Amino acid sequence: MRIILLGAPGAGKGTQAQFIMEKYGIPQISTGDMLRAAVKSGSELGKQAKDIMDAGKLVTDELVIALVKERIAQEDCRNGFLLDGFPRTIPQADAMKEAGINVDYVLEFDVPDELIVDRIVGRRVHAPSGRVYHVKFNPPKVEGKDDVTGEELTTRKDDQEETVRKRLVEYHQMTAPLIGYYSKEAEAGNTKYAKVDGTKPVAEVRADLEKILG
Ligand SMILES: Nc1ncnc2c1ncn2[C@@H]1O[C@H](COP(=O)(O)OP(=O)(O)O)[C@@H](O)[C@H]1O
Ligand SMILES: Nc1ncnc2c1ncn2[C@@H]1O[C@H](COP(=O)(O)OP(=O)(O)O)[C@@H](O)[C@H]1O
Ligand SMILES: [Mg+2]
């Protein structure tokens, strides 16, 4: 199974990706995480990016597209994967068609602008695993600590309010057209498309997805 998750930053994509990956065995492919990690190591594809992310602007299409192509060439993706943050522009989506990468499901998280900032300002991550927390809406069991390793959680550098607003503008300009893009792909039968209410609590969004994916 191959899945794309669409939605504003802070819509809940990464959070729900973890559950999908655990129930259905397909890895999460999060270009944001890959970029943030490639930034960290600085010895692989996608090293050039910290200044662009930190502005809240998208990395250039070709770079990301390659990074994903290499990432899905790994043996763990061969039976399925979950794209989370990719494609993020019409060129990235067209490059998937160009490369012969079909998708079985596109899952749209509906979450209004007015909820996005509180979500992202309170976000805490465990980078090594991708686990995502929210200090209030989905907290670690122990404040400040990853549930599994006990490692102290971090804040992403792009999770500041000012930056989050510019990201949202950028999102509505370059990435929201993907909604219509994959709706048209679904009307033509080339994918299954579904819209979920991403304002519900985490466990309810989780249950709504379970009911779509069987
Ligand atoms: N597919 C992509 N194309 C271009 N830039 C990307 C892509 N994915 C991630 N980025 C960069 O990473 C940043 C954060 O991405 P991401 O972790 O997915 O944010 P969020 O978790 O809020 O959805 C983006 O603002 C952008 O600079
Ligand atoms: N359904 C939800 N309701 C409230 N907060 C949520 C929900 N889903 C995720 N969050 C929290 O809001 C933030 C954004 O979620 P996240 O999955 O990182 O979004 P994305 O990957 O879309 O950028 C995180 O701190 C997460 O814990
Ligand atoms: Mg995310």
Q: Where are the domains of the chain?
A: 1-214
21 lines ligand 2 (CB under 6 A): no
Ligand nearest to the CA of 35: 1
- The resolution of the experimental structure, rounded to one decimal in Å, is 2.1
Name the 3-class secondary structure at 109: strand
On whether the 1-214 domain is CATH 3.40.50.300, my answer is yes
The catalytic residues are 13, 88, 123, 156, 167
- Identify residues whose C-beta is under 5 A from ligand 3, the ion: 14
- Please state, in angstroms and rounded to a whole number, the distance separating the CA atoms of residues 91 and 191: 18
64 lines ligand 1 (CB under 6 A): yes
Choose among 11, 1, 2, 65: nearest CA to 179.
11
Residue nearest to atom 1 of ligand 2 (CA): 202
The answer to whether the CB of 38 falls within 8 A of the CB of 46 is: yes
Cα dist from 57 to 54, 89, 102, whole Å:
8, 12, 27
CA of 96 from ligand 1 middle (Å) equals: 17
- Please state, in angstroms and rounded to a whole number, the distance separating the CA atoms of residues 14 and 48: 23
Residue nearest to atom 14 of ligand 1 (CA): 32
For residue 57, which phi and psi values (nearest 5 degrees)? -110, 155
The answer to whether the CB of 50 falls within 8 A of the CB of 39 is: yes
164 lines ligand 1 (CB under 6 A): no
Helices (H) and strands (E) in the chain, counts: 9, 7
140 lines ligand 2 (CB under 6 A): no
DSSP E strands, 31-85: 81-84
